[PDB]
Paper text:
Macrophage infectivity potentiator (MIP) proteins are key microbial virulence factors that facilitate host cell infection, intracellular pathogen replication, and dissemination. They are found in a variety of pathogens of both bacterial and eukaryotic origin, including Burkholderia pseudomallei, the causative agent of melioidosis, Legionella pneumophila, leading to Legionnaires’ disease, and the protozoan parasites Trypanosoma cruzi and Leishmania subspecies. All MIP proteins share a peptidyl-prolyl-cis–trans-isomerase (PPIase) domain resembling the FK506 binding protein domains of human FKBPs. All MIP and FKBP proteins share a general domain topology in their core PPIase domain with an amphipathic five-stranded β-sheet wrapping around a short α-helix, thereby forming a hydrophobic active site32. Inhibition of secreted MIP proteins diminishes macrophage invasion and leads to the reduction of overall pathogen load and virulence, as shown for L. pneumophila and B. pseudomallei, respectively.
Here, we determined the crystal structures of B. pseudomallei MIP (BpMIP), which contains only the core PPIase domain and T. cruzi MIP (TcMIP), which features the PPIase domain and a free-standing α-helix (“stalk”), in complex with fluorinated pipecolic acid inhibitors. In all cases, we found that the inhibitor molecules bound within the expected FKBP-like domain cleft that forms the MIP active site. NJS224 carries a fluorinated thioaryl group (henceforth denoted X1) and an isopropyl group (X2A) and gives rise to a single resonance at −113.19 ppm. The spectrum of NJS227, which carries the same X1 moiety in addition to a para-fluorobenzyl group (X2B), features two 19F resonances. In agreement with very similar KD values for either ligand, the distinguishing moieties, i.e., the iso-propyl group in NJS224 and the para-fluorobenzyl moiety in NJS227, do not make substantial protein contacts and furthermore face in opposite directions. Comparing the crystal structures of TcMIP and BpMIP with NJS227, the inhibitor adopts a highly similar binding stance and the respective protein side chains align well (RMSD = 0.58 Å). The fluorobenzyl group attached to the sulfoxyl group, i.e., the group present in either inhibitor, is nestled into a hydrophobic pocket formed by F43 in β-strand 3a and V97/I98 in the loop between β4 and β5 in BpMIP and the corresponding residues F73 and M125/I126 in TcMIP. In the crystal structures, the inhibitor’s piperidine ring rests within a hydrophobic cage formed by conserved aromatic residues (Y33/Y63, F53/F85, and W66/W94 in BpMIP and TcMIP, respectively). Interestingly, for BpMIP, the NJS224 X1 line width is broader, while for TcMIP, NJS227 displays broader lines and thus presumably reduced flexibility. Finally, it needs to be noted that for both TcMIP and BpMIP, the X2B19F resonance showed a much more pronounced CSP than the X1 moiety.
Author numbering: 7 to 163
The structure:
């Protein structure tokens, strides 16, 4: 039965997202995306919705299983914010070159009710660590001023 598995997946996944939101340096955005800043980069602009980004990353289920990783391919993968899941679209448009964040994405901002491919079941929250290596022809989105105001409103809740 997938319905019994989904009821379980819904409860423990909620607990997982509740745990990381309680971690000390974790930031919680109104959408539900929770992240932790690992490294602070020297970039000045964030990528726009259609900018190409050079990214090193690793994705984990909340039980520890890694389902994908760009380091075993060795070189960085190219993505656009308008090509990825919602949690990745929101995070990328707030990160500058050199930043390293750990993302905790609830299922409704990831692959949702259907799931993602083979190794990501329905109602699954996702854990990513993400490094933004560079942005093609420079970021054309948020400046450092726009980003800090979004974090300032977040920590104000
Ligand atoms: O799915 C995507 N866009 C379409 C879409 C669907 C639904 C909602 N919104 C958008 C993109 C682009 C992509 C498409 C097809 C691929 F084969 C690979 C990438 N992906 C991602 O957003 C995340 C983000 C981090 C990099 C890539 N992954 S990922 O690691 O989870 C992929 C993965 C999933 C399960 C695995 F077992 C292994 C790998």
């Amino acid at each position: 039965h997938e319905e019994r598995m989904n009821n379980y997946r819904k409860r423990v996944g909620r607990l997982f997202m509740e745990q990381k939101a309680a971690q000390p340096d974790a930031v919680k955005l109104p959408s539900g995306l929770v992240f932790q800043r690992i490294a602070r980069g020297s970039g000045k602009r964030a990528p726009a919705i259609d900018d190409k980004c050079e990214v090193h990353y690793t994705g984990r289920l909340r039980d520890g299983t890694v389902f994908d990783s760009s380091r075993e391919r060795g070189k960085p993968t190219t993505f656009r914010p308008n090509e990825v899941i919602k949690g990745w679209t929101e995070a990328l448009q707030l990160m500058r070159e050199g930043d390293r964040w750990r993302l905790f994405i609830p299922y409704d901002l990831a692959y949702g009710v259907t799931g993602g491919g083979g190794m990501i079941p329905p109602y699954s929250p996702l854990e990513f660590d993400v490094e933004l290596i560079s942005i093609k022809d420079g970021g054309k989105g948020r400046t450092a001023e726009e980003v800090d105001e979004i974090l300032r409103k977040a920590e104000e809740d």
